[PDB]
DNA sequence: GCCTTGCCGGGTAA
DNA sequence: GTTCCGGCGCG
DNA sequence: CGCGCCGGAACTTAC
DNA sequence: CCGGCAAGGC
């Protein structure tokens, strides 16, 4: 497990990425796996090797691809099983296990968290995937709080209190998964 | 004096 | 980040 | 006919 | 995501 790979990739996902279920002309269709990055060398040299293993892991046959936008790299994997794989475990968010949910926010703050560390704090549109957050930080003794940071464009902010800095950058950021 | 954290505008990286 | 497109594969 | 993988790329905006 | 500013508190 494999668990801990997969929330951590969940955690990339609803951050810089998503889960797209397409329906083309006519009728056909197509499920997506994304991951987005602009370095070309974060996603071909340490995402996509934890998404081949998972691939690997699940018999999924669809290829890993790279595709290249002019502002950012694109991973996508198309694949039914691999899309419902995560969107099952998404839905399933609220019940994760510890190493699960350490693994999440990790992801997450790999995605959009404040990577200067001069402040340790989440964006996010979701609220309630932010709450969720909030309450697992704080089981974990991690102090927080959740304020509309953003009126334009309706953004949400988790901010980390700084006094228990030492235990959010030992016990999500530096974490073994 | 200094740390912290809400507020809020610019613009890259989604 | 999200959704078109034209292509192909396959029962 | 109906549906699912590929390879984009244009289009939009949430961090 | 970044980061300047200002106000609260030790
Ligand atoms: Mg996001
Ligand atoms: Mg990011």
């Avoid at 998404?90 to 997450?108: S, T």
């Amino acid at each position: 497990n494999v668990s801990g790979i997969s929330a951590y990739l969940l955690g990339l996902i609803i951050g810089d990425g998503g889960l797209y279920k397409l329906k083309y002309k006519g009728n056909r269709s197509e499920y997506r796996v994304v991951i987005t990055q602009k370095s070309e060398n974060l996603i071909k040299q340490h995402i996509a090797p934890l998404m081949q293993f998972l691939i690997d892991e699940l018999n999924v046959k669809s290829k890993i691809q790279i595709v290249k936008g002019d502002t950012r790299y694109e991973l996508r994997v198309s694949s039914k099983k691999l899309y419902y794989y995560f969107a099952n475990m998404l839905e399933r968010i609220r019940l994760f296990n510890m190493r699960e949910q350490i693994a999440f926010i990790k992801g997450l703050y790999v995605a959009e968290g404040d990577k200067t560390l001069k402040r340790l704090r989440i964006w996010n549109k979701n609220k309630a995937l932010l709450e969720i957050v909030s309450r697992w930080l704080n089981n974990l003794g991690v102090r927080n709080t959740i304020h509309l940071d953003d009126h334009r464009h309706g953004v949400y902010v988790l901010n980390i209190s700084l006094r228990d800095r030492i235990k959010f950058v030992h016990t999500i950021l530096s974490s073994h998964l």
